[PDB]
Design a protein around this ligand. Structure first.
Ligand code: GDP
Ligand code: GDP
Ligand code: MG
Ligand code: MG
Ligand code: MG
Lengths: 260, 259
């Protein structure tokens, strides 16, 4: 039950799940709702690494906003993007303190869910995100996309290649995911399934496009197949809980694979 | 000699240069300063596509802030990241207006410099930026990085492949560049240059990393070597004008190759 005080055998490895995605893709909604789903059976901790957000739908165990917020920095004269970068520059003076706090959490909880800066570039291109990721034990990254971006074959290539680049940059296993699938018709869902998950098939379709862009997509997609095995993809809805069972399975499978 | 009024030959294709990079990398600084550089000889127009910035170092011919700002949206109750996205959703309703204004500038100026949203993901992951790029004549994208992100061998891989991804996404020739190189010691400068300019050296360095991510970069870099020849990385300073001569030459060469 959610109201149970679940016990974690201290030091028994936890599952650290890190949600990453462009601003508005659903990281925060997913963090809260997936955590609520897990709370029935597991001891869950939440980490908020976003300095921007006004209201969280979960109760954070760690909340970087207690140190500084973007809104506070803007009151000092910064523009919003200037303030975002500055908030993470300032947060770096507390890096070891936050890192150590998260490590403590991983020892005391079954799951640690980490909700990242609202702009994924703040997480990928700032030392704070990079250094954190380097120092966590086998975190699982779930990279969520908004299906609205996926209109033509080349778009599927773009999103899958981006996921590979996140893996490269963060040095962590990255699961490509769609969020907001509740907004999709069954016809829409099937189209996405055709192109988004089967890379051999996507590659084949890109090969048919004789244009410069198609050629490029075909080369990148083909390289991707050789640089990365198959990989399971997720179709999630942070609103309806669609795909949560799938995510939970993948996390447990990653858990088992790690530490062997 | 800011008082010059250079003439552009009507019927003459302009050069469109688009600056893209993560927040804080120097897009706005570079736009203004490279513009000021070009203004010695050319009729230059500036397009600001960023809804967030409070003050520009150049005078924009087109400025999306006249329609809406992130700050205005925040006054409505939005947090900053919610407001950034909302700003572009609102602008999209006026896409044709802005596309058409930019197309007009391109007929009337030698150079049109486009300063993109402060957050690169707004440009690459929002309809506004990708639909704009699809509709511009042979734009040159300059993708700038802060040298401070180049901490290890795999970072060089990352930058090269990120530029490739941008080229795919935007369908435009993308030049990778470092900005802020004025901040670099002479050793730092040569190290970066070594990894970017000596692909086999880079790949060999990647080989030594026994980490699980080591092998990936290794595998990739070596496949890039094969199928997608490494484009020359530019070294710029928006502060000191380092690299500006190089950028202007590449822009003209791209222009010639496109005409
Ligand atoms: N329909 C739908 N809306 C969602 C879903 N997940 C998030 N949202 C909405 O998308 C907006 C952005 O969500 P948020 O979690 O703040 O995105 P973040 O910036 O990635 O943290 C909010 O209005 C959410 O209610 C989903 O699965 N389905
Ligand atoms: N030292 C140095 N600082 C720079 C350079 N270019 C930009 N900056 C500074 O970096 C910060 C962010 O620059 P800005 O142009 O606003 O970046 P943007 O968000 O990409 O548009 C500002 O303080 C600039 O003064 C450069 O070439 N050298
Ligand atoms: Mg969020
Ligand atoms: Mg700003
Ligand atoms: Mg700017």
């Amino acid at each position: 039950m959610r109201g149970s005080h679940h016990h974690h055998h201290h030091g028994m490895a936890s599952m650290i799940v890190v949600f990453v995605g462009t601003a508005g893709s659903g990281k925060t909604t997913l963090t809260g709702e997936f955590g609520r789903y897990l709370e029935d059976n597991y001891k869950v901790a939440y980490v908020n690494l976003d300095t921007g957000v006004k209201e969280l739908p979960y109760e954070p165990s760690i909340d970087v906003r207690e140190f500084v917020t973007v809104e506070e920095i803007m009151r000092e004269g910064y523009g919003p993007n200037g303030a975002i970068v500055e908030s993470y520059d300032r947060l770096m003076e507390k890096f070891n303190e936050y890192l150590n706090k998260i490590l403590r959490l991983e020892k005391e909880n079954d799951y640690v869910l980490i909700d990242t800066p609202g702009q994924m570039e703040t997480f990928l291109f700032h030392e704070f995100g990079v250094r954190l990721m380097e120092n966590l034990p086998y975190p699982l990254v779930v990279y969520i996309s908004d299906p609205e971006i996926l209109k033509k074959p080349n778009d599927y290539c773009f999103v899958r290649f981006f996921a590979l680049l996140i893996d490269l940059r963060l040095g962590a296993t990255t699961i490509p995911a769609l969020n907001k699938v509740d907004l999709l018709s069954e016809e829409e869902k099937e189209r996405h399934r055709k192109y988004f998950e089967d890379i051999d098939y996507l590659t084949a379709r890109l090969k048919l496009d004789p244009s410069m862009q198609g050629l490029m997509a075909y080369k990148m997609c083909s390289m991707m197949t050789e640089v990365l095995p198959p990989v399971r993809v997720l179709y999630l809805s942070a609103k309806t809980r669609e795909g949560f069972e799938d995510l939970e399975t993948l996390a447990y499978e990653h858990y088992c694979t790690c530490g062997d």
